[PDB]
Curated annotation (Swiss-Prot):
Annotated S-S bridges: 22-63, 56-95, 153-204
Recorded catalytic activity of this chain's protein: Preferential cleavage: Gly-|-Xaa, in proteins and in small molecule substrates
Enzyme Commission number: 3.4.22.25
Keyword Kinase part of the UniProt annotation: no
Annotated source species: Carica papaya (Papaya)
Gene Ontology biological-process entries: proteolysis
Note: Substitution of the conserved Gly residue by Glu-23 could possibly explain the unusual specificity.
Residues of the full protein shown: 133 to 348 of 348
Active site annotation, chain numbering: 25, 159, 179
GO function terms (MF aspect): cysteine-type peptidase activity
Function as written in the Swiss-Prot or TrEMBL entry: Thiol protease with a substrate specificity very different from the other thiol proteases.
Designated name of the protein: Papaya proteinase 4
Length: 216
């Protein structure tokens, strides 16, 4: 919708987290999009549990990769608990949802953005935080510590992150993304990746698989 967005400024984004040594980026990004839509709908910003999804999403593989849609679908079906009540342990344990406290923040649906298209992605970010995919394998993404990432990445996505805003700074458009590698990476745990570029799969394949929780 507008020339710029930043959900952190509107108070819809929680602190940058650490996945640690576990392949749970899918769980991290989906929680960030849900904390985002809850605050948007509810006015309440609370941290939710990536651990519950890690142990509880049975379509995904805990600390060995998982899905955007299946974790988003888990919350739509069962709701999700508070982070403080179901602590992150960086290892897949037995599902504690029923023992922890049965459903807390719940959504009712899950949407996937029309793929390979700048316009649709911005329209979705304009409404709330979106779960996006990016190729993080490279050394430039890896040792990134600041500015608008033009790249040196291909499109072989391998990481789910959270698109929290977009804008233009110095002539260039960008997508503001919340990464889960702690505050010691990029711009305090964040990365501005250059946007679009003639190729619709996007920079570092950021236009490939974008999902958002739907709260009716």
């Amino acid at each position: 919708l507008p020339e710029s967005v930043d959900w952190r400024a509107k108070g819809a984004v929680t602190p940058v987290k650490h996945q640690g040594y576990c392949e749970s980026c899918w769980a991290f990004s989906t929680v960030a999009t849900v904390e985002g839509i809850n605050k948007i709908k509810t006015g309440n910003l609370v941290e939710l549990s990536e651990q519950e999804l890690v142990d509880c999403d049975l379509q995904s593989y805990g600390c060995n990769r998982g899905y955007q849609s299946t974790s988003l679908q888990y919350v739509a079906q069962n709701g999700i608990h508070l982070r403080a009540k179901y602590p992150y342990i960086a290892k897949q344990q037995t599902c504690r949802a029923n023992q922890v406290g049965g459903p807390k923040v719940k959504t009712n649906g899950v949407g996937r953005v029309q793929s390979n298209n700048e316009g649709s992605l911005l329209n979705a970010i304009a409404h709330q935080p979106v779960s996006v995919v990016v190729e993080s394998a490279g050394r430039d993404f890896q040792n990134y510590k600041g500015g608008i990432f033009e790249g040196s990445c291909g499109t072989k996505v391998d990481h789910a992150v959270t698109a929290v805003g977009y804008g233009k700074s110095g002539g260039k458009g960008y997508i503001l993304i919340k990464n889960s590698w702690g505050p010691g990476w990029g711009e305090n745990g964040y990365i501005r990746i250059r946007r679009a570029s003639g190729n619709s799969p996007g920079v570092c394949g950021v236009y490939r698989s974008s999902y958002y929780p739907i709260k009716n």
